[PDB]
Amino acid sequence: GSSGSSGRQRSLSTSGESLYHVLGLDKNATSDDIKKSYRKLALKYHPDKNPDNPEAADKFKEINNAHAILTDATKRNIYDKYGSLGLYVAEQFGEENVNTYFVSGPSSG
């Protein structure tokens, strides 16, 4: 909570690209698109299908995290508002903790 008047607004700082790319979708991609796609991208980049494969681990390792992050509102909002950094802080500190951290910056009123 602790919000009613301030209502911090979002800034168009982010470049544009996001996890969506990691898989092959766009900003106009619906959760369903992420889940469905994740499947095909998981069966092809399967660890068992590609034994002792360097590129396989890199890709798959990326898909899991990507989808795993997109398959969650809590984070989905963090990666959308903050991004990669937000996840870190919110990792140990906590989503609620990431509030005071950001809320307090070069911005005011």
Side-chain angles (χ1 to χ4, degrees):
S2 306
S3 68
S5 293
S6 174
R8 185 89 283 287
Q9 58 175 298
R10 67 153 188 174
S11 274
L12 271 299
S13 283
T14 54
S15 294
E17 189 195 30
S18 201
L19 286 168
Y20 319 123
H21 209 249
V22 177
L23 309 170
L25 288 173
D26 300 336
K27 280 203 153 287
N28 295 268
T30 54
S31 51
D32 272 42
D33 297 23
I34 304 169
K35 310 156 88 177
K36 295 209 284 204
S37 70
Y38 159 82
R39 298 178 191 190
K40 48 173 89 188
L41 309 164
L43 275 270
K44 70 196 210 172
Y45 286 126
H46 210 258
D48 179 275
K49 303 271 162 177
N50 309 263
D52 313 311
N53 198 262
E55 68 163 77
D58 274 299
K59 270 283 90 150
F60 197 52
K61 177 270 270 280
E62 270 209 59
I63 312 185
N64 278 269
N65 90 252
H67 170 259
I69 292 171
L70 305 160
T71 40
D72 199 83
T74 303
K75 305 205 88 84
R76 269 267 29 81
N77 201 341
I78 299 163
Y79 200 76
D80 181 40
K81 210 190 185 289
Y82 317 138
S84 61
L85 183 70
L87 299 184
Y88 152 33
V89 181
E91 203 157 54
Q92 63 197 230
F93 297 94
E95 209 207 54
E96 62 204 37
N97 276 253
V98 172
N99 210 63
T100 176
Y101 270 111
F102 279 54
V103 90
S104 285
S107 288
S108 168

